[PDB]
Design a protein around this ligand. Structure first.
Ligand SMILES: C[S@@+](CC[C@H](N)C(=O)[O-])C[C@H]1O[C@@H](n2cnc3c(N)ncnc32)[C@H](O)[C@@H]1O
Ligand SMILES: C[S@@+](CC[C@H](N)C(=O)[O-])C[C@H]1O[C@@H](n2cnc3c(N)ncnc32)[C@H](O)[C@@H]1O
Ligand SMILES: C[S@@+](CC[C@H](N)C(=O)[O-])C[C@H]1O[C@@H](n2cnc3c(N)ncnc32)[C@H](O)[C@@H]1O
Ligand SMILES: C[S@@+](CC[C@H](N)C(=O)[O-])C[C@H]1O[C@@H](n2cnc3c(N)ncnc32)[C@H](O)[C@@H]1O
Ligand SMILES: C[S@@+](CC[C@H](N)C(=O)[O-])C[C@H]1O[C@@H](n2cnc3c(N)ncnc32)[C@H](O)[C@@H]1O
Ligand SMILES: C[S@@+](CC[C@H](N)C(=O)[O-])C[C@H]1O[C@@H](n2cnc3c(N)ncnc32)[C@H](O)[C@@H]1O
Ligand SMILES: C[S@@+](CC[C@H](N)C(=O)[O-])C[C@H]1O[C@@H](n2cnc3c(N)ncnc32)[C@H](O)[C@@H]1O
Ligand SMILES: C[S@@+](CC[C@H](N)C(=O)[O-])C[C@H]1O[C@@H](n2cnc3c(N)ncnc32)[C@H](O)[C@@H]1O
Ligand SMILES: [Cl-]
Ligand SMILES: [Cl-]
Ligand SMILES: [Cl-]
Ligand SMILES: [Cl-]
Lengths: 374, 374, 375, 374
């Protein structure tokens, strides 16, 4: 059997708490000052939250109040954490490279490599393993908040394995771990989780006879930052493509759009998704590489995994003709100065049928089709 | 239209790598005193603060300040440069009971997750050439910084290497380096030193010497280390692994004892893949393994040979299953992970290190694989 | 999500409203085969174990309504003892008849007042909305497979609904939904796989994406069906019969009606105009509204809407239509051979864009006239 | 070239409307006795037969003969005019299990389907003027028939009004009425009465009086009601709604309890559209909603403002999502659909009825829409 597996984590997972605080701080800066330079990193461990990084802005963000906005809906209060604010300014050496003399150009905020990915497995143009893993946790957290699923807490993880041996996928295993109250009823808990798992499988017209692994540790009462240290940018595969897509290593949360790790990753997704939606391939991955201070990528590679429906050279040419690779220009084309990032800090940045993200729009299919012709 | 693949590396004074080094230095000290330590040490370094956190249950005592100074003093920092915060929590007893089975003789996985192992035949290291070259550039620059053969530079540095794989012999397309330099440097001397190092590395691998060189594209890099950019443990996971050519499941290595399968199973998967390729069963091999917390074996496995298999894929899969022990306690012991020193892999990658002697890099399973693949 | 997601439906041959439309039109066809001057307005109700055949017929024909009903219901699996049949056939009001039969002038007066809309667009080779085309194709294929036994343990009552995202210039399928009546002992895994493959095969036939949401038997159980599960009546699927909610509708039903009922004949006429306008490349979409008065031989109003997709001035389209078509009711009925057309075939799967049939109102025989008259 | 739009209405003695009235009178009787009734009552009226059929599961008992007599006696019929057939089946238990969820806080949609809600600013009713005028003609004639101000007429009648929208002020182009009359009527009196009523309605809406009048074009209409034409429930769905100016999804209203979304969601969509227009977000608004049997929320929505939007269409869409709850059970309760009497909307249209007090006609969401659209 060909068994592929991906994961997700919930809103009370400690790494995700950090991503949410980073992006909530970013969103508050950008709401006040659209030219903010923000690289906000957070650490959450036991009873300490550290808010750090490099920010140059006209805004003022109350980082304590912002942190409380993320942690109060998970059950924490104002006395649970020491908060350390260590906000440095952006290095003037980086800033002079980004802010070019030509005021219509933005130089890349760093070197690096990013990958964008899309496939035709799901309506989201995402790997089915990742879609199912996120949907499981979104439903559990929805029920936790509405009180349809009682005596659970917000720290949780999922993992879904799919059998791709035949042309119809089968679910092989669904796994969930959910932090629970000391006085929980394990029979009620197992039945709730089993039902949620089946409901998600049925929503995607899949089999319902898969293995279920429910709270395999056998006890999960200690959780959140008490059980495990969180840091920003430690769930980059959960944030992206579940291990089916390649990754260049850059984290998203807490970064303004001049950080190409974020903005060019969104751009690359937008390209790949439109290539696949245009039916030029079943799977498409776009690698882009950058040099600090340079306003365009220094390299690009387009991989269609032998699923291309037209010549690879024509795909590559259609992409070059249909997209503008100037950083300032693609930041503007995707409205990244006015996008709210907090909503993508949980449950993935891509394929979000619950959100309206610019990099998910299929508005380049007509250009790609026209530019790919004979 | 050329096929250009790009990977990166970072130096010992890069702030994320400072954190990885402190994490692994702390781990090495714990394991030297107590081979049953449970350690998950996470570090943040920003401006003038180093935060040492995570979850440790041990009979050892580690002087975290002294350990941090051992990493930062060779980079030019002193005892008054950083506030050091020590926030060492204990391992959750709920996780511990799942890992330390009542049985004895078994170790349960320390978490769920997915890991990937990768190997290819491009280099004697069985690693992607892009990654090998990127690391070799920075190792040589840092060697010269310490010997004073390359003056007026500092320890924060990055590299990026682009290779053109359009034809059967790879060609270097671009080598890029950024190196933190002193205010009073001589840019002409600096450019000449870097150019020569780039050519020397290319010649060491018998490659072309006519490639593009991008040297300090920002045009000024005086501010650096944690002053210029916040570092965190486990934020260079692609640099630590396969440079974007191999998949990644998202787990970080540094600071973790071998019961954390993100580390131990990633090493195990590498060991498998490298032996597959060394046994000439394939030119490239990638192995995915998935885990469930508390369970002593993987819950899923997938083997990809990218259509470079020299025998039937099913026989490779079977030979792997027959030639390795998938029990976690057993593979931890087969790789001598309780007595391996991790600090040396906290810079310049955990894989393909022909400068080190790592158990997961040994070609001691070739014989078994060949026998079991009939 | 913020999107232009447009949705249309279809229903199958064993859907209870469609059973009624088929019995209505089969009765009409038998009358017109015997007497081309028949006046027929045949309405059918099917509930539980009763079929009522009613309406107003004046004819020299004789139709065996029981035998006709059995011709519709036997291929769906019913037998001769499943329904009580009530035949309540009244004559056409002589007050309506004298208005329609203008023997004096050689004219036909409209059989009623009313408004009709004809519609066409360039999305499909049928010149129909893609949502409607796909919805019908799904059910035609499932019913084809039911009869050939390629798809087992299903019954004839079924519905489909297709949602397309038109937010950008290329349409993408958003959702395909089907509900199919199934046997008690069915295998849900086999059923899901069969439906999924049919859905994908229809998408691929039209060169569309195959990664859309699939909603398959959302009720979770559909063993009770046909008139037992739901009452059918003639003329309760007028949007399925026409343009799936993309086109406007004036409210008139088609089935069971002879061509003097302008609800039917003028609807067909308006489709014929709209289709030819679009095929002539005068517009990408065209909707024609016509209004009538009982006893009057021509429409009392007309409006032509090209939805801002006109390729030439709207006044020239309007003029070309007036020069190319004859709006006298008797004349357009004869131009479309409506007295000799068989209507049973259009009582399932829609009256328009039927590339599986040869309908007069679907012929592109006015394109040359429209192009010439638009200059 | 004039832009002439036309709509119709029919009177209380029209045979299709007789059926709609008996359907809704039966429904009202069921709901007065049992608010959890499930009712889908369909009626056929032809020559001398009335058939009362459909699917009802209830604790109520309705005397269907007495109910039918309550509709037909004020139209001049008596107890010996019709054979009455009662064929009341129960609701399919297969449908019922889908609608009446185990989770008793949800109602699943009673069927699949598409509904459209519409509103425009042409009249105080927020309805197309053509429809408003057509209904007003027949309401006034029927009022006069009953008060004996218009003698020697009967209750079967129809109207049709054509308006020229070529210029910014609408002009009436044609008014057409047909009214069933006694054999011994005086045609001159009748023509003058109808002409005056037509002028009186035009003057009520401040319109022109120079339009074409088409009065009893057939030239004789003594035979009428079910003797002249067969009626069925749900055969005037355009007259019931928006006169051909709004789109329609094909579902009928009369005889259905609120779990049939063809009715309840049509009312809900009207309530949205009307409030959008009253809030001055657009001059015309049409809302399409699609449903799946057993699912408690719509599966699709589209909002069309016909390029008359006064703010961005995305902000209208967002304001609607924030201001309305799309859960079926919730919108049924918000509109008090279990306790609304439906008989009054079975003649003269279900929308824009400034002579009734309908929940879906209340402008009680304008403040929410304005607030949520900033
Ligand atoms: C407070 S902000 C803006 C002050 C003033 N409104 C202005 O435009 O100058 C100025 C600097 O404070 C630093 N800073 C430190 N903590 C901060 C916080 N919580 N929010 C915003 N900036 C902060 C950043 O480096 C930032 O560039
Ligand atoms: C298992 S912990 C990671 C290792 C931890 N750092 C240690 O000291 O062993 C990682 C994630 O698993 C989840 N987790 C925490 N305690 C758990 C338990 N008792 N059972 C299952 N999952 C748990 C939480 O989401 C947590 O962030
Ligand atoms: C210091 S250790 C060893 C003490 C004594 N040797 C023993 O065997 O119990 C005990 C606990 O201290 C906590 N601790 C806090 N900081 C520490 C540090 N710097 N090194 C080791 N353990 C630390 C860990 O949770 C660990 O389990
Ligand atoms: C450019 S910084 C990352 C973004 C930064 N947090 C900011 O506030 O914009 C990332 C890495 O690039 C390198 N770096 C820092 N300053 C640099 C410069 N002035 N030129 C080039 N590379 C630099 C250092 O290795 C640093 O860790
Ligand atoms: C049976 S038809 C034709 C009889 C005879 N062949 C003739 O030419 O007079 C005469 C009338 O019967 C009434 N009728 C009742 N049931 C009928 C049916 N089943 N087929 C045709 N006409 C029917 C219609 O009103 C029709 O005008
Ligand atoms: C759902 S029924 C209509 C409401 C019904 N009269 C009642 O009493 O609730 C309308 C159509 O849906 C289909 N239908 C019937 N039973 C169904 C079921 N159990 N699941 C799905 N669709 C069904 C049939 O095509 C039927 O004509
Ligand atoms: C008359 S009601 C039952 C009266 C009894 N009060 C009860 O609660 O059970 C029971 C069934 O009768 C059927 N029925 C037949 N004709 C009916 C009618 N005229 N009014 C109500 N139900 C009728 C419906 O299917 C309904 O669910
Ligand atoms: C004209 S009839 C429709 C077709 C009719 N079933 C037939 O057999 O020809 C439709 C409606 O028009 C009205 N109508 C009936 N007889 C009429 C007449 N003599 N002149 C005008 N309208 C009439 C009634 O309102 C009736 O419900
Ligand atoms: Cl984790
Ligand atoms: Cl970096
Ligand atoms: Cl239906
Ligand atoms: Cl009518």
């Amino acid at each position: 059997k060909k068994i592929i597996t991906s994961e997700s984590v919930g809103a009370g997972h400690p790494d995700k708490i950090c991503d949410q605080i980073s992006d909530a701080i970013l969103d508050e800066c950008l709401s006040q000052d659209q030219n903010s330079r923000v690289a906000c990193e957070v650490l959450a461990c036991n009873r300490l939250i550290v808010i750090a990084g490099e920010i140059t802005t006209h805004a003022y963000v109350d980082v304590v109040k912002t942190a409380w906005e993320i942690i109060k809906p998970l059950g924490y209060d104002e006395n649970d954490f020491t908060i350390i604010s260590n906000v440095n300014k952006q290095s003037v050496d980086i800033a002079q490279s980004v802010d070019k003399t030509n005021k219509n150009l933005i130089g890349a905020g760093d070197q690096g490599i990013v990958f964008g990915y899309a496939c035709d497995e799901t309506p989201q143009y995402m790997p089915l393993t990742s879609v199912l893993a996120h949907e499981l946790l979104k439903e559990i957290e929805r029920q936790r908040r509405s009180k349809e699923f009682i005596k659970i807490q917000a720290d949780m993880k999922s993992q879904v394995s799919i059998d791709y041996s035949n042309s119809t996928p089968l679910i092989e295993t669904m796994l969930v771990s959910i932090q629970h109250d000391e006085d929980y009823d394990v029979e009620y808990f197992n039945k709730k989780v089993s039902a949620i798992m089946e409901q998600i499988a049925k929503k995607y017209n899949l089999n319902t006879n898969f293995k279920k692994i429910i709270n395999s540790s056998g006890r999960f009462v200690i959780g959140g930052p008490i059980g495990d240290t969180g840091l920003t940018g430690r769930k980059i595969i959960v944030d992206t493509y579940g291990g089916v897509g390649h990754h260049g290593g850059g984290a998203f949360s807490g970064k303004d759009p001049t950080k190409v790790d974020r903005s060019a990753s969104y751009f690359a997704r937008w390209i790949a998704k439109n290539v696949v939606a245009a039916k030029l391939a079943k799977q498409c991955e776009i690698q882009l590489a950058f040099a600090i201070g340079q306003p365009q990528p220094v390299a690009m590679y387009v991989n269609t995994f032998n699923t291309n429906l037209i010549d690879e050279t024509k795909i590559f040419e259609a992409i070059k003709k249909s997209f503008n690779f100037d950083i300032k220009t693609f930041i503007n084309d995707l409205n990244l100065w006015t996008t709210k990032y907090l909503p993508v800090a949980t449950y993935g940045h891509f394929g979000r049928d619950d959100l309206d993200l610019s990099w998910e729009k299929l508005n380049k299919v007509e250009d790609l089709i026209k530019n790919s012709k004979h």
